[PDB]
Amino acid sequence: SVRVLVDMDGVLADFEAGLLRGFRRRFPEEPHVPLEQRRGFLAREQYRALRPDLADKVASVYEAPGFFLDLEPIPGALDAVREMNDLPDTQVFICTSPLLKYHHCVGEKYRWVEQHLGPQFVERIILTRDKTVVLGDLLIDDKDTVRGQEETPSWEHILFTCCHNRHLVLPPTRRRLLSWSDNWREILDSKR
Amino acid sequence: SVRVLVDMDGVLADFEAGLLRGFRRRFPEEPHVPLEQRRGFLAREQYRALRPDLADKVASVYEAPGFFLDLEPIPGALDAVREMNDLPDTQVFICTSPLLKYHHCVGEKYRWVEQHLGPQFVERIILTRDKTVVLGDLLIDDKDTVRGQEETPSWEHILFTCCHNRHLVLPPTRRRLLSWSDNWREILDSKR
Ligand SMILES: O=c1[nH]c(=O)n([C@H]2C[C@H]3O[C@](c4ccccc4)(P(=O)(O)O)OC[C@H]3O2)cc1/C=C/CP(=O)(O)O
Ligand SMILES: O=c1[nH]c(=O)n([C@H]2C[C@H]3O[C@](c4ccccc4)(P(=O)(O)O)OC[C@H]3O2)cc1/C=C/CP(=O)(O)O
Ligand SMILES: [Mg+2]
Numbered sequence: 001s002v003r004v005l006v007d008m009d010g011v012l013a014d015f016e017a018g019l020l021r022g023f024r025r026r027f028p029e030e031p032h033v034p035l036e037q038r039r040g041f042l043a044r045e046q047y048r049a050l051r052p053d054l055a056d057k058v059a060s061v062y063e064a065p066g067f068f069l070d071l072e073p074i075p076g077a078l079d080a081v082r083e084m085n086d087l088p089d090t091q092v093f094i095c096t097s098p099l100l101k102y103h104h105c106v107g108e109k110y111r112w113v114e115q116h117l118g119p120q121f122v123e124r125i126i127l128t129r130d131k132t133v134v135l136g137d138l139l140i141d142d143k144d145t146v147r148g149q150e151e152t153p154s155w156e157h158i159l160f161t162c163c164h165n166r167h168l169v170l171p172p173t174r175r176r177l178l179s180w181s182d183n184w185r186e187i188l189d190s191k192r
Numbered sequence: 193s194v195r196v197l198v199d200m201d202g203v204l205a206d207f208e209a210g211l212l213r214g215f216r217r218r219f220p221e222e223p224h225v226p227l228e229q230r231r232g233f234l235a236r237e238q239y240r241a242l243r244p245d246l247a248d249k250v251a252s253v254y255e256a257p258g259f260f261l262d263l264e265p266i267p268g269a270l271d272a273v274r275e276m277n278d279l280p281d282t283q284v285f286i287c288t289s290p291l292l293k294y295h296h297c298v299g300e301k302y303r304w305v306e307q308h309l310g311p312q313f314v315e316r317i318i319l320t321r322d323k324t325v326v327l328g329d330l331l332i333d334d335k336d337t338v339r340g341q342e343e344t345p346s347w348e349h350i351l352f353t354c355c356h357n358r359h360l361v362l363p364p365t366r367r368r369l370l371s372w373s374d375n376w377r378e379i380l381d382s383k384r
């Protein structure tokens with residue numbers, strides 16, 4: 001009865017932490033962007049701002065085999081999604097956009113879900129570059145604005161807080177989840 | 193804008209021909225189901241009916257590396273979807289369900305679209321086991337019934353004719369496309 005679309009990167013899987021970890025490992029001498037200093041959704045472009053050739057170095061991290069497979073879960077995310085999926089009159093899909101360089105992204109995302117959440121959740125994956133054409137009541141996603149071919153999506157976007165969006169000032173009509181320890185049940189209840 | 197959701201297997205990519213090619217190649221002594229004797233969506237179950245050991249043999253074909261990558265296009269399909277996508281006020285997405293055994297399916301489907309239709313079409317893939325949650329005006333799909341969590345999808349299901357579904361006689365209110373040489377433009381225009 002309430003359908004919740006849950007983003008993967010930035011909500012379930014810690015893309016930012018994995019990016020920084022891989023960058024520091026492969027480019028140990030280079031300046032980096034600490035997580036707390038991250039601003040703006042597109043990490044590559046903050047690195048570009050720091051120094052131009054860092055853009056390609058940071059892309060080489062998220063394009064590498066293993067990158068998606070080895071991401072750590074966001075604290076509390078897995079337990080929240082498991083709990084959420086067991087709620088009566090509640091349907092959960094993992095709604096995730098793959099990279100344009102899809103080669104080591106798409107399969108790895110299925111495998112990450114299989115490992116962390118199990119085969120039953122693999123059946124709930126929707127891979128799409130356009131979330132506005134997917135039907136649901138809520139979308140929990142860390143991107144500032146989620147855009148696509150539907151000017152008016154079916155879902156309300158609930159901004160999942162990450163360091164990169166922490167400083168965004170939202171109008172009163174937009175809601176934010178601070179973390180998975182925040183009151184997501186109340187948000188779901190507000191749509192029943 | 194008319195948004196067309198186009199199935200991949202059975203509509204763009206010839207799963208049935210690929211299955212039989214691989215089966216004859218790997219299991220030449222075994223009985224097979226000629227293409228035109230296919231009946232029912234689930235190929236494996238017709239093979240099981242023919243002789244029980246053939247169920248696992250035929251699964252080993254569609255589970256193998258390269259199976260999805262090497263499928264031949266359905267006649268006229270690629271020209272049709274390119275033409276369709278190039279039409280004023282028309283948006284195409286490829287809406288496709290991966291196998292539960294996803295390992296050699298998911299990445300190979302992206303690669304098949306990239307090779308056959310190009311990067312602009314890779315951006316239009318929606319991978320989902322539930323098509324009823326995807327918003328569109330039309331879904332062109334060979335499966336006799338397309339089910340999911342949305343009891344009343346937004347799309348009209350246009351049954352794409354294949355040997356396995358040709359025995360079905362649709363009531364006057366439902367539409368079939370006999371092939372891509374059939375008058376698909378009329379079905380699109382009927383939605384504008
Ligand atoms: O969180 C992110 N942070 C980030 O810095 N990037 C990077 C990787 C690469 O991804 C893209 C991107 C755009 C849209 C959807 C998914 C991916 P790409 O266009 O290069 O593939 O965009 C610019 C680049 O920005 C992507 C992501 C993607 C998240 C997927 P989501 O929106 O489903 O959570
Ligand atoms: O056309 C088909 N014919 C066929 O015989 N099969 C086989 C492979 C394997 O696929 C499944 C299947 C079910 C639903 C969607 C996708 C795949 P699986 O449940 O094993 O993954 O079902 C039983 C098996 O039947 C699948 C397909 C899948 C097509 C995907 P689509 O509906 O998006 O075109
Ligand atoms: Mg995200």
Ligand SMILES: [Mg+2]
Pocket residue numbers: 199200201202203333334335
């Ligand atoms: Mg099909």
